[PDB]
Amino acid sequence: MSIMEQPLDLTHIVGTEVKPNTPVLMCSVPGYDASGHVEDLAAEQNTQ
Amino acid sequence: LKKLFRSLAMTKPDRQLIAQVMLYSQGFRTAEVLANKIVPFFKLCDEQLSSQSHYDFGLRALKSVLVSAGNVKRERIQKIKREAENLPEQEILIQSVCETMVPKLVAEDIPLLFSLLSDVFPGVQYHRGEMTA
Amino acid sequence: LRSACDTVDTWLDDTAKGRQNISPDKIPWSALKTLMAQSIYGGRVDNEFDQRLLNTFLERLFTTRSFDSEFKLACKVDGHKDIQMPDGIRREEFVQWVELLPDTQTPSWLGLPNNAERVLLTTQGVDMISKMLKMQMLETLHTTASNWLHLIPQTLSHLKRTENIKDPLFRFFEREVKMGAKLLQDVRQDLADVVQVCEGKKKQTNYLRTLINELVKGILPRSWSHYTVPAGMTVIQWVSDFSERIKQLQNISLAAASKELKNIHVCLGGLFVPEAYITATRQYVAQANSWSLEELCLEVNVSFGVTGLKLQGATCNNNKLSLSNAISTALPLTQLRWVKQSVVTLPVYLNFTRADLIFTVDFEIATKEDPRSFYERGVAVLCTE
Amino acid sequence: TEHPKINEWLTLVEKEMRVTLAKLLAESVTEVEIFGKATSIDPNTYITWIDKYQAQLVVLSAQIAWSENVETALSSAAPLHSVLSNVEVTLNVLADSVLMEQPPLRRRKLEHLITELVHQRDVTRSLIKSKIDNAKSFEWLSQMRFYFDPKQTDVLQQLSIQMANAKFNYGFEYLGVQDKLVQTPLTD
Amino acid sequence: LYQYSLQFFLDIYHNVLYENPNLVTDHTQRLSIITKDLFQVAFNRVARGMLHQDHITFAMLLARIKLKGTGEPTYDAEFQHFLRGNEIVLSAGS
Amino acid sequence: LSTRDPTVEFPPDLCSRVTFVNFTVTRSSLQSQCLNEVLKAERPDVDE
Numbered sequence: 011m012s013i014m015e016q017p018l019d020l021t022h023i024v025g026t027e028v029k030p031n032t033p034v035l036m037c038s039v040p041g042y043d044a045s046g047h048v049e050d051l052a053a054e055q056n057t058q
Numbered sequence: 059l060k061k062l063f064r065s066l067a068m069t070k071p072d073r074q075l076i077a078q079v080m081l082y083s084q085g086f087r088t089a090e091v092l093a094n095k096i097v098p099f100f101k102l103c104d105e106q107l108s109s110q111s112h113y114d115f116g117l118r119a120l121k122s123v124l125v126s127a128g129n130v131k132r133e134r135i136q137k138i139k140r141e142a143e144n145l146p147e148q149e150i151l152i153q154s155v156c157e158t159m160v161p162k163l164v165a166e167d168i169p170l171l172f173s174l175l176s177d178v179f180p181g182v183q184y185h186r187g188e189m190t191a
Numbered sequence: 192l193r194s195a196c197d198t199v200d201t202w203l204d205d206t207a208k209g210r211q212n213i214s215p216d217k218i219p220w221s222a223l224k225t226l227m228a229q230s231i232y233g234g235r236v237d238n239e240f241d242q243r244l245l246n247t248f249l250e251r252l253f254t255t256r257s258f259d260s261e262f263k264l265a266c267k268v269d270g271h272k273d274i275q276m277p278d279g280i281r282r283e284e285f286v287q288w289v290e291l292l293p294d295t296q297t298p299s300w301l302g303l304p305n306n307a308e309r310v311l312l313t314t315q316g317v318d319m320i321s322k323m324l325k326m327q328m329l330e331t332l333h334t335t336a337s338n339w340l341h342l343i344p345q346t347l348s349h350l351k352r353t354e355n356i357k358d359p360l361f362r363f364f365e366r367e368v369k370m371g372a373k374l375l376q377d378v379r380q381d382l383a384d385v386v387q388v389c390e391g392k393k394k395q396t397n398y399l400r401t402l403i404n405e406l407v408k409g410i411l412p413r414s415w416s417h418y419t420v421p422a423g424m425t426v427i428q429w430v431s432d433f434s435e436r437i438k439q440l441q442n443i444s445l446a447a448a449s450k451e452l453k454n455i456h457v458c459l460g461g462l463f464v465p466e467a468y469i470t471a472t473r474q475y476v477a478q479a480n481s482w483s484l485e486e487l488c489l490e491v492n493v494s495f496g497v498t499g500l501k502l503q504g505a506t507c508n509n510n511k512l513s514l515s516n517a518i519s520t521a522l523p524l525t526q527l528r529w530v531k532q533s534v535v536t537l538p539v540y541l542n543f544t545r546a547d548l549i550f551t552v553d554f555e556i557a558t559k560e561d562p563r564s565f566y567e568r569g570v571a572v573l574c575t576e
Numbered sequence: 577t578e579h580p581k582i583n584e585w586l587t588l589v590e591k592e593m594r595v596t597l598a599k600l601l602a603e604s605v606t607e608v609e610i611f612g613k614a615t616s617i618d619p620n621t622y623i624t625w626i627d628k629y630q631a632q633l634v635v636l637s638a639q640i641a642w643s644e645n646v647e648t649a650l651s652s653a654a655p656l657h658s659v660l661s662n663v664e665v666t667l668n669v670l671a672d673s674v675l676m677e678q679p680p681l682r683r684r685k686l687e688h689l690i691t692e693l694v695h696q697r698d699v700t701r702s703l704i705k706s707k708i709d710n711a712k713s714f715e716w717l718s719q720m721r722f723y724f725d726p727k728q729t730d731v732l733q734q735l736s737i738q739m740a741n742a743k744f745n746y747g748f749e750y751l752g753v754q755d756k757l758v759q760t761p762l763t764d
Numbered sequence: 765l766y767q768y769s770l771q772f773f774l775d776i777y778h779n780v781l782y783e784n785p786n787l788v789t790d791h792t793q794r795l796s797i798i799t800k801d802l803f804q805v806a807f808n809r810v811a812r813g814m815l816h817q818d819h820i821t822f823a824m825l826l827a828r829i830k831l832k833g834t835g836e837p838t839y840d841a842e843f844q845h846f847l848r849g850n851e852i853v854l855s856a857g858s
Numbered sequence: 859l860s861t862r863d864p865t866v867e868f869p870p871d872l873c874s875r876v877t878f879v880n881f882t883v884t885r886s887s888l889q890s891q892c893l894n895e896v897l898k899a900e901r902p903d904v905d906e
Binding site: 326 | 817818820821848
Binding site: 198201202205219221222225226 | 714715717718740741
């Protein structure tokens with residue numbers, strides 16, 4: 011369970027594990043939001 | 059949406075500083091003494107009276123009392139001119155306090171208000187009438 | 192975090208223009224610390240004590256003793272442990288220090304007592320036991336209600352209604368007894384009605400049916416919830432506290448009937464509104480000394496005696512605060528005196544939730560410990576517990 | 577009389593309102609400089625200046641002059657005490673004036689100035705209580721600061737209002753008199 | 765909050781069996797490598813979308829699964845006493 | 859009539875009207891699928 015303490019490899023997961031027809035559910039507790047994380051990921055991957 | 063705004067808490071305003079300089083601006087010789095007497099009076103009657111749902115002894119009530127005190131001091135000055143020198147500033151403040159706070163009280167809280175007024179200001183008396191027409 | 196980093200970048204851009212390194216004194220330490228103590232991190236802070244805690248954290252951490260080497264960021268354990276600040280000057284070195292840090296942490300890392308984590312860990316163990324039991328499992332009533340109904344009300348018999356004095360304390364005590372008697376009369380009428388409809392010839396009404404349903408569920412009715420309800424307590428816990436408050440009010444009324452009202456050692460937890468009592472005794476001192484209400488300050492030692500005060504993470508010893516790992520300890524008797532004009536200033540809350548601050552008390556400091564350490568450990572005084 | 581469009585001449589009215597307020601503010605700042613540079617002040621010309629210029633303009637020009645004097649004092653101890661003495665002398669003149677009977681418009685215009693000068697007095701007292709290195713000290717950068725540069729040809733963007741690493745151009749919207757707020761530490 | 769599907773489990777099959785790292789080429793050791801990788805990847809993928817409170821519960825369940833699969837004698841009575849014996853009824857006046 | 863959500867509530871009238879056929883997954887079927895898939899991954903010609 012040492013992998014869980016590291017931050018998410020979101021680019022690897024969305025490039026390999028995630029099928030195109032399966033949505034990526036970015037659940038969060040109140041006080042947290044991952045939309046900025048996805049925007050940063052898109053900026054890294056140069057995707058519109 | 060919360061990330062697009064910068065938050066800041068507004069919990070308790072400085073009622074002493076709010077009252078003192080505006081009494082100074084309206085023009086009062088004992089402005090600091092009146093300010094030091096009126097804010098603790100409001101804080102004390104906010105809880106020593108009965109807990110009615112229509113009671114409000116906050117900043118809006120205090121500011122309305124101070125504005126009314128300035129207005130009635132100007133009215134007294136105009137009445138003297140019709141008839142600046144020294145004026146009963148404490149009596150003016152008590153007149154504004156009575157005219158703003160007395161009508162909201164229940165029947166068992168008016169003597170309590172007058173006891174608080176006598177405790178804070180010794181020379182209080184009362185002003186009423188003058189509505190013959 | 193992003194706003195703080197942007198402010199740091201803006202301040203460094205304003206200070207230096209392309210310089211490779213800056214001296215620690217030329218860094219706007221006070222500017223950055225005040226700016227993110229008042230606007231960035233202190234914006235959402237509601238309490239003055241939380242603001243003081245944030246201020247002392249920022250003041251201890253971000254002065255760094257002007258980038259002093261081997262700076263003590265914190266203590267890992269209160270006894271024989273430390274965290275050393277890394278001397279690297281690069282993101283790679285800081286990241287390496289981060290993974291070099293040990294995985295298992297303790298609440299003493301935060302300047303907190305270690306006993307705050309014990310209840311949470313026990314609750315988490317019970318919860319995971321219950322979850323494993325859940326997966327393993329996957330792999331009349333009104334007579335008992337009437338029995339409890341007949342079991343409760345014997346602790347309450349009567350209360351006076353309560354009568355024309357100008358004392359600042361007497362009228363407050365009288366109105367306290369007044370709404371206490373009103374609530375007690377309403378409770379007695381409800382109990383008599385439900386007794387009549389459960390054992391007798393009386394049909395069910397809507398209000399009494401809702402009372403039956405809510406009392407069987409175990410939630411306090413909103414009608415009985417006049418004063419503060421701590422974090423949604425249960426009815427069996429609330430009824431005993433309500434009985435003790437009634438007993439205190441009965442003692443107050445008996446002593447007033449026989450001023451003698453000053454000699455009563457009132458419990459602050461038994462009062463419906465506690466702060467009104469403190470302001471009432473402030474006005475009593477003011478009218479006794481012919482002084483002003485605002486100028487009277489607090490000097491509390493362990494001429495008005497209060498009881499039922501519990502601390503949090505410290506103990507009292509001849510008006511001296513000593514840190515202890517115990518959760519709480521009880522003050523037998525506490526007296527308050529009013530005088531117009533390093534020390535520690537503790538907050539006093541009604542309950543353990545600390546959702547409503549009542550008033551603050553200034554004590555005397557210990558010889559060995561640091562006021563920042565007191566604030567980080569978070570010593571307070573509780574009443575209704 | 578040339579029959580322009582309603583929106584066109586309304587836009588002209590708005591823009592030239594802003595430019596007129598900027599010009600009047602420039603003349604007002606010149607007058608406050610030539611008045612409050614000295615220690616003693618003359619109420620007989622103080623009343624005429626206040627009756628001449630608008631309430632927002634007199635309050636803002638007092639703020640501009642006080643900020644400029646404190647900036648000059650910090651550029652260079654004793655000049656800070658000179659600024660405090662000027663503030664207290666103006667406060668005494670203000671107190672005497674509100675003790676006299678006055679029309680309501682000038683009474684409000686004068687009460688606003690009393691409030692602003694009391695706030696300036698408090699800032700000066702706290703700043704003297706603290707220690708100053710230069711104009712880059714945060715104890716001075718934490719307050720609202722006003723700067724005037726008459727050399728600029730763009731009179732609309734001539735006034736600059738500055739907080740700690742914050743720069744603002746005055747919008748020059750006509751606010752009339754309105755109600756001025758008391759600057760508490762919570763307000764700061 | 766976490767509902768998992770047989771399609772999800774088949775996806776983790778397609779992501780473990782096909783793209784297994786270090787593709788030992790021996791039918792004996794590849795079985796153990798596939799087994800260990802399947803347990804670890806299952807824990808990782810399930811724990812991506814569940815709370816840190818329940819992370820340890822899922823890990824202990826996977827430890828129970830590994831004990832059942834292994835040869836190792838599972839202490840069924842001790843496991844049942846750890847699970848349900850915490851709420852067992854005790855003797856009167858004990 | 860077909861559905862993909864097993865955690866759906868049907869009204870009693872529709873329950874009376876229709877015959878329910880639930881396609882749940884069983885341990886034996888899951889083990890058979892797992893054995894077939896590990897055969898295809900390890901020995902594809904043998905599986906065919």
